[PDB]
Homo-oligomer: A and B are copies of this chain.
Amino acid sequence: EVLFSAVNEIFEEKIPFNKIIGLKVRFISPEQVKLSFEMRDELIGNAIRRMLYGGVISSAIDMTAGLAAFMGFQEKMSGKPMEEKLAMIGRLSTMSLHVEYLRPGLGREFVCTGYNVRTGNKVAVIRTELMNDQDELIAVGSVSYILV
């Protein structure tokens, strides 16, 4: 209850990129997370549109994996209060980001699902799947998050 409320504030309301790319937390659990993204500016007519979409997709994947890593690490913090769990999210840092693109993005809205593969002591490995409006897989990702 308090976890979903705290996570929504941080991810939906407090990110200043919101003016250019919308973000909504659709699902959260210790094993799986789902974020939906909305391109407020679709970038039609830009000379490097495809290129710019590459960076947007990598950031979307990294963000989804960061929320998945948080849910994996907070699950292990069993008897800790909500303040210390919320403080831990600020220590999450990406160690490795591997993204393979299957086709061009070029869409208004896309969705990204993050599956927590294994959460060790310090490293949380997440596998991601990013699709468009039409339920078509456009990119897949392997992301490693650590506590710094």
Q: Is A30 an interface residue (CB 8 A)?
A: no
Asked whether, in the complex, the Cβ of A104 is within 8 Å of the Cβ of B100, the reply is no
Contact with B along A124-142 (1 / 0, CB 8 A): 0101010100000100100
Q: Is A108 an interface residue (CB 8 A)?
A: no
A-B residue pairs in contact (CB < 8 Å), sample of 30: A10-B48, A14-B46, A15-B52, A47-B89, A51-B93, A54-B97, A55-B59, A55-B60, A55-B62, A55-B63, A58-B58, A58-B97, A59-B59, A94-B99, A96-B98, A96-B99, A96-B100, A96-B101, A97-B98, A97-B99, A97-B101, A98-B99, A103-B103, A103-B148, A113-B120, A115-B118, A115-B120, A120-B127, A121-B131, A123-B137
**A interface with B by C-beta (< 8 Å):** 10-11, 14-17, 19-20, 41, 43, 46-52, 54-60, 62-63, 66, 86, 89-104, 113, 115, 117-118, 120-123, 125, 127, 129, 131, 137, 140, 144, 146-148
